[PDB]
Amino acid sequence: AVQLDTQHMGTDVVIVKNGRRICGTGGCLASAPLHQNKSYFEFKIQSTGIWGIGVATQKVNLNQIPLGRDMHSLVMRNDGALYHNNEEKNRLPANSLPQEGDVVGITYDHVELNVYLNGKNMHCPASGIRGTVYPVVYVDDSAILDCQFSEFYHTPPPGFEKIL
Amino acid sequence: AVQLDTQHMGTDVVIVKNGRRICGTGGCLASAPLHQNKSYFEFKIQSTGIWGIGVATQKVNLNQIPLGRDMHSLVMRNDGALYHNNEEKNRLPANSLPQEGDVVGITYDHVELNVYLNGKNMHCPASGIRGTVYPVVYVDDSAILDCQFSEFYHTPPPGFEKIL
């Protein structure tokens, strides 16, 4: 099963619940790369705080909070802003700020990353990044995120499938 | 995917979140029978209230909760007691009763149903029932339960597999 990879996690990251839950401080890559045209994955915001979700290469520093500060990661942060190379690429409108209990869906097709909130397209795309990319997640400040790589709360957006 | 079956649900049952969440009032069968020798599945108690989890045949009345009151269902209820045919078969320890946020794991090996809480074997079996059985769940009084039929929070116990 695709899960949070304990071989690729930050120093103070805790992975529990069969590779599904991240807490502590830092980031983790998923156990498989986005080696397909169209990928969908989800995180449930069990406890909010500082967190973000997106894609990264194996060059990413998994102690970097927040991610998106350099070329190695593209993430939606907990404030809804999408960052890569320390540049704001897009932002969810304030009316759609992610809240505790939300499911955040990510699509990635190598051309763009898009965000879905509880099954709804936010239409806030950011251009894809260079290199071999993996799902990435980070937490701090008491955030707890749970991954769904196969058994989704939301039907994958059409054309997108679970990571193989 | 195995999910909550909207063809086999109580009158006031609401199934949302890609067939994974039950709310409202009444019971629901999962979409696949327990054909295999050893099955594991889970429910997360998103909101507590009146609820129960276990197995049932297609004869079960999904409006007449709680279940376990006749030959057609065997359930652990929100009080931690296991009932079949209107008899208390077993009961969790009084300081280990299920709580809101818990993941309840269920094994069924046709000999017995057993209960896990947060990956911990509760050693609380009840004898298996007659006929072809399905996973069953019911809710009322503001209970919300989310199923995991494949992407589990806890690894199945040795020999047990997800429903095929």
From Swiss-Prot, chains A, B:
Entry keyword set: Acetylation
Q: What is this protein called?
A: SPRY domain-containing protein 7
Paired cysteines (S-S): none
The major lineage groups are: Eukaryota, Metazoa, Chordata, Craniata, Vertebrata
Q: Which organism is it from?
A: Homo sapiens
Q: Which residues form the B30.2/SPRY domain?
A: 1-158
